[PDB]
Design an enzyme around this catalytic site. Sequence first.
Site, PDB file in Angstrom:
ATOM      1  N   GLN A  67      -3.474 -18.789  25.370  1.00  0.00           N
ATOM      2  CA  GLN A  67      -4.148 -17.503  25.471  1.00  0.00           C
ATOM      3  C   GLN A  67      -3.932 -16.703  24.196  1.00  0.00           C
ATOM      4  O   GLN A  67      -4.875 -16.131  23.640  1.00  0.00           O
ATOM      5  CB  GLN A  67      -3.604 -16.758  26.694  1.00  0.00           C
ATOM      6  N   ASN A 121      -3.372  -8.949  16.565  1.00  0.00           N
ATOM      7  CA  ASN A 121      -4.094 -10.104  16.044  1.00  0.00           C
ATOM      8  C   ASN A 121      -4.799  -9.784  14.733  1.00  0.00           C
ATOM      9  O   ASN A 121      -5.001 -10.678  13.902  1.00  0.00           O
ATOM     10  CB  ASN A 121      -5.089 -10.593  17.089  1.00  0.00           C
ATOM     11  N   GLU A 155       3.126 -26.176  -1.798  1.00  0.00           N
ATOM     12  CA  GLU A 155       4.164 -25.533  -2.591  1.00  0.00           C
ATOM     13  C   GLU A 155       5.282 -24.999  -1.703  1.00  0.00           C
ATOM     14  O   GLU A 155       6.466 -25.159  -2.020  1.00  0.00           O
ATOM     15  CB  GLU A 155       3.558 -24.398  -3.414  1.00  0.00           C
TER      16      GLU A 155
HETATM   17  N1  LIG Z   1       1.216 -11.295  19.145  1.00  0.00           N
HETATM   18  C1  LIG Z   1       0.495 -11.505  20.240  1.00  0.00           C
HETATM   19  N2  LIG Z   1       1.074 -12.134  21.321  1.00  0.00           N
HETATM   20  C2  LIG Z   1       0.352 -12.352  22.443  1.00  0.00           C
HETATM   21  C3  LIG Z   1      -0.968 -11.957  22.526  1.00  0.00           C
HETATM   22  N3  LIG Z   1      -1.432 -12.301  23.745  1.00  0.00           N
HETATM   23  C4  LIG Z   1      -0.439 -12.909  24.431  1.00  0.00           C
HETATM   24  N4  LIG Z   1       0.676 -12.932  23.637  1.00  0.00           N
HETATM   25  C5  LIG Z   1       1.990 -13.511  23.945  1.00  0.00           C
HETATM   26  O1  LIG Z   1       1.870 -14.705  24.688  1.00  0.00           O
HETATM   27  C6  LIG Z   1       2.973 -14.817  25.555  1.00  0.00           C
HETATM   28  C7  LIG Z   1       2.635 -15.645  26.790  1.00  0.00           C
HETATM   29  O2  LIG Z   1       1.772 -16.705  26.447  1.00  0.00           O
HETATM   30  P1  LIG Z   1       0.167 -16.638  26.531  1.00  0.00           P
HETATM   31  O3  LIG Z   1      -0.458 -17.112  25.246  1.00  0.00           O
HETATM   32  O4  LIG Z   1      -0.301 -15.260  26.925  1.00  0.00           O
HETATM   33  O5  LIG Z   1      -0.101 -17.678  27.718  1.00  0.00           O
HETATM   34  P2  LIG Z   1       0.011 -19.232  27.355  1.00  0.00           P
HETATM   35  O6  LIG Z   1       0.856 -19.428  26.127  1.00  0.00           O
HETATM   36  O7  LIG Z   1      -1.351 -19.849  27.160  1.00  0.00           O
HETATM   37  O8  LIG Z   1       0.694 -19.852  28.669  1.00  0.00           O
HETATM   38  P3  LIG Z   1      -0.004 -19.730  30.107  1.00  0.00           P
HETATM   39  O9  LIG Z   1       0.012 -18.321  30.660  1.00  0.00           O
HETATM   40  O10 LIG Z   1       0.740 -20.641  31.047  1.00  0.00           O
HETATM   41  O11 LIG Z   1      -1.419 -20.202  29.934  1.00  0.00           O
HETATM   42  C8  LIG Z   1       3.376 -13.396  25.897  1.00  0.00           C
HETATM   43  O12 LIG Z   1       4.777 -13.285  25.879  1.00  0.00           O
HETATM   44  C9  LIG Z   1       2.803 -12.550  24.787  1.00  0.00           C
HETATM   45  O13 LIG Z   1       3.853 -12.019  24.021  1.00  0.00           O
HETATM   46  C10 LIG Z   1      -1.556 -11.324  21.446  1.00  0.00           C
HETATM   47  O14 LIG Z   1      -2.728 -10.970  21.520  1.00  0.00           O
HETATM   48  N5  LIG Z   1      -0.821 -11.099  20.299  1.00  0.00           N
END
Ligand SMILES: Nc1nc2c(ncn2[C@@H]2O[C@H](COP(=O)(O)OP(=O)(O)OP(=O)(O)O)[C@@H](O)[C@H]2O)c(=O)[nH]1
Lengths: 170, 50, 427, 426
Positions: free
Chosen positions: C10, C218, C244
């Site tokens: 996500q 983002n 590098e």
């Molecule tokens: N920096 C940043 N971190 C994000 C963002 N969206 C989600 N996260 C981080 O992603 C973490 C959880 O993982 P996600 O990517 O949301 O979900 P996933 O990794 O696909 O895992 P699942 O929920 O099982 O599908 C959270 O702790 C957030 O800190 C974002 O837009 N920017």
Amino acid sequence: AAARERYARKNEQNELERAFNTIDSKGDKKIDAEELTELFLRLGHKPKRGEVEDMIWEVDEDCDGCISLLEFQTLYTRCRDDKTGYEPRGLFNVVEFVMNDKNNQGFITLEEAMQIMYLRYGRAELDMQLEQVFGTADLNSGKILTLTEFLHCLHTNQVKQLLNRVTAKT
Amino acid sequence: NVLNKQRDDTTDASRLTPGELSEEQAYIQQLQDEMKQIDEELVEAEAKNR
Amino acid sequence: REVISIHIGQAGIQVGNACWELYCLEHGIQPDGQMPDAFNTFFSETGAGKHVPRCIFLDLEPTVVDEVRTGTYRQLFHPEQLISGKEDAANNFARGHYTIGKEIVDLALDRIRKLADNCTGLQGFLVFNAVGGGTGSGLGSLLLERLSVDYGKKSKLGFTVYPSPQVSTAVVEPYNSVLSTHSLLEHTDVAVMLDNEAIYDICRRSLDIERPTYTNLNRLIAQVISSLTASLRFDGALNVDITEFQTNLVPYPRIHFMLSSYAPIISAEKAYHEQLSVAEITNAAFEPASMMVKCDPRHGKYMACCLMYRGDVVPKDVNASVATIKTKRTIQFVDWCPTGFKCGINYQPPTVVPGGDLAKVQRAVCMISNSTAIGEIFSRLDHKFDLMYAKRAFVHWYVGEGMEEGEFSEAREDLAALEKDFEEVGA
Amino acid sequence: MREIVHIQGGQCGNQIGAKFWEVVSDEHGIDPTGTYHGDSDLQLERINVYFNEATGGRYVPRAILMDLEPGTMDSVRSGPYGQIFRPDNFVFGQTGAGNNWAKGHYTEGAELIDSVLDVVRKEAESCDCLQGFQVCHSLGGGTGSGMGTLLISKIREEYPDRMMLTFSVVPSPKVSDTVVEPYNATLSVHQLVENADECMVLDNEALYDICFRTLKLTTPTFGDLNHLISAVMSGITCCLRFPGQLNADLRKLAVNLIPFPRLHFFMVGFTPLTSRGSQQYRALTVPELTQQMWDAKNMMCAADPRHGRYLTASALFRGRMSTKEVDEQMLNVQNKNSSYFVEWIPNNVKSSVCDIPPKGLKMSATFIGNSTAIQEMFKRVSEQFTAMFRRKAFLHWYTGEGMDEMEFTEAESNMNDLVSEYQQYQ
Ligand SMILES: Nc1nc2c(ncn2[C@@H]2O[C@H](COP(=O)(O)OP(=O)(O)OP(=O)(O)O)[C@@H](O)[C@H]2O)c(=O)[nH]1
Ligand SMILES: Nc1nc2c(ncn2[C@@H]2O[C@H](COP(=O)(O)OP(=O)(O)O)[C@@H](O)[C@H]2O)c(=O)[nH]1
């Protein structure tokens, strides 16, 4: 060091005359390139495609073509006193081998007699021309003497001073 | 069905594994020998020139 | 030369939505895919005047992927690239690594193969993932395993999001971070950390945004990537490539964890009243008020640092500025390394996207350094992971999926061994 | 007559040479399209040293560009005088070394230098009587250091009885761009001590201070540094291209300046170098040229000769001047500062005059001094190298690519004996 050489010449002259006649196969005074291969076969060594032509070319320098007994003594003396001359020695070696032969397979300890006559040198210097050791004898032939002498002359010739020079330190 | 799918993939993986090229390694070996021969051939000729 | 960018989870594909937005707005391409040669590193050309990005979005839950399929960039992305599963790993590392991962990563691989085949001078891959989740953690590590056995010699730039020390959204994320690092250790060649609380503090103080959502986070991540690939996309006075960083920044094959920062993150009003030059942005790249990972390099010692410079920057003052940093004594470098810097200047300024909250700045610096303060974060993770593991909380979900108690203890001692490794190089 | 081919390696080498061919072409009157437009016959009679007439007044430079990245090559053909090089001379890899000297010397070198040598061989046989080769490169980079290094070794094995110059910038702790600079410097110099005929030590610190105080520039981009370096390189070869009262070829200077075969690293200066505020307030005389020439700050290397003694020194003067002033100036600058010159060689300064100045100036000079102060640089990098090597930092890209431990130990040993033999001969 002159006495060794003068005495050696005094005795080898008679051996040399017969060595010449024996190398000749046509019962004449001229030594043709044809005879040289026959001699090598007697020694048991084989010439390369152009070796004989170089052998005949380098020795003769008062006329062109076949060699003559007069050229042969001139060669003998010049080569013998040649030491720091950087001069050719292609056909000197085969004749010196034949003269220093009396066994009709080669010679063993007589290398040292050859060596001392050329110079007192060293036991280590002997370990240079061949691998003969004081106690052990060996079997030898024409093949192992000419090649090693020829290679040694090429090895000395290469070394010269360009950036290999070494000066006393400051 | 899934066992047959997995088996085909193993056979593909075994086909892909790099295999020693005999007809080519020997060529390389023979080329180096001729190269080394010419080096020694060259040093005798340079000696002749001096 | 080409580099392809893969996004898992996500957080991964949301980051990509900001990156490709920034890219087309930089190279003058409309979202539909046509111009009204430097784009060759990222976009392949159809030959009919259409440009397609070198990227694959993949995850296990179809929600975040299908808003992308219907946003403005419906026509920019090739359909096959936007992979999507059917059900989520649900913050469960094992579920993403053995149960559901084993069906989806093979489809991603036979896709990524023809992206590499279309390329000619492939510089490497670069991966985006957040370790707190299950998709980005589980099949991310699985994907890195299979990528290492496939290519090996090619760089794999891992821009990962580690869980913040105090600000967290999940509760089983300590388990997920430890088990994921256990494989991210020996696969990723160069792994950059991006925390979330640090970016939160930057938007609060620097951008003076008091109500930030994920969009702004983002946005600035894409800005750092753009600053890092400008050297590959455009010509400068002193450029570096992606190969590098493999040599110049990681002294030992297991110490590859970099602290990133960027300057100047300045709102629309400070720029009007403030001055931009090379010396002050060289300063601002080092102060911990502008770092992207909650750690303090003041507590650590530097091995080697890297400095991206963008815009109207001459080389005389980048040298003078880095000299002033070395003569200061607030930060110190390791005894074994007399010289600890890798500098780079590129001609093109950072472009701006409408709707973003980044000002149009004349010059910018992107710093990527390596230190030992990173050792404190890993240790900080171990305290609260070990805290719950002894009583076997939440273990039943992972072991019910098909794992055992063995991999917790063996992964635990491996990262514990890494703690001792960091302490002995610092001495 | 006598011909010098040009070889540029890496990014630093390529950009240095681009400004070099521009300045040289301006001296001989060739426009950027490659045609002759000069007036004097003295310009047409000696362009065979650096060019070849192609067809219908087309003069192409006798140069070879060589590196590992496409950005540098494209940056050459983009700028002016970029269309004069023959496109076949762009020997060129694609992958890159990444500031890894092993990749430049063992991994990527094995597939490029053979191709580089074909172009170099073609340029040597294209001319009749070679005077030497001219290589511009760095010592801290990978594709300039390693690639150019292996090229130098192979070339000396092919054409050994020919001169060879290497114009090389060296790294210094204050101007530190790469992190592995010491690993590259000590190994590169370890090859230069046994391959190059004579090397010219350059560094970026001196270039920065020349543009700060002497030139008084505000924004000294790399174009100006390359502009400075090009004037020095044109000065070393003016004797071959223009007649004069006292000619001095490359061989004449090397045999006269190098008293011992391994001690062939030089310090360079150039005169006149004046700012636009003072270009009007000055005179042009031989003594005015000499003091600005022998100045410590005006050395184009950051190694102060006044910390040591001069072994030999050379002066190449250009312009209509009186040879008495040349000889008496060298004698006076040696008599007052008598302690700075070595004792067991009298008249440690060789001087020569050429009758053609650079375009736009009435009278110039070029200094080539072989001093003993250069050991500072070798120690300054040697200790940094030993500091890194005693914990094997950054070693796995070296040992994993083909180097072993004995190579670095060989580098230290050769490093240490050279600084020790400099110390003896001083
Ligand atoms: N920096 C940043 N971190 C994000 C963002 N969206 C989600 N996260 C981080 O992603 C973490 C959880 O993982 P996600 O990517 O949301 O979900 P996933 O990794 O696909 O895992 P699942 O929920 O099982 O599908 C959270 O702790 C957030 O800190 C974002 O837009 N920017
Ligand atoms: N004079 C000059 N030096 C340069 C230029 N570009 C880079 N350098 C020097 O080159 C060194 C880095 O070498 P690099 O360019 O990476 O060499 P390469 O990769 O082998 O071509 C630095 O110490 C710079 O001082 C330039 O345009 N002019």
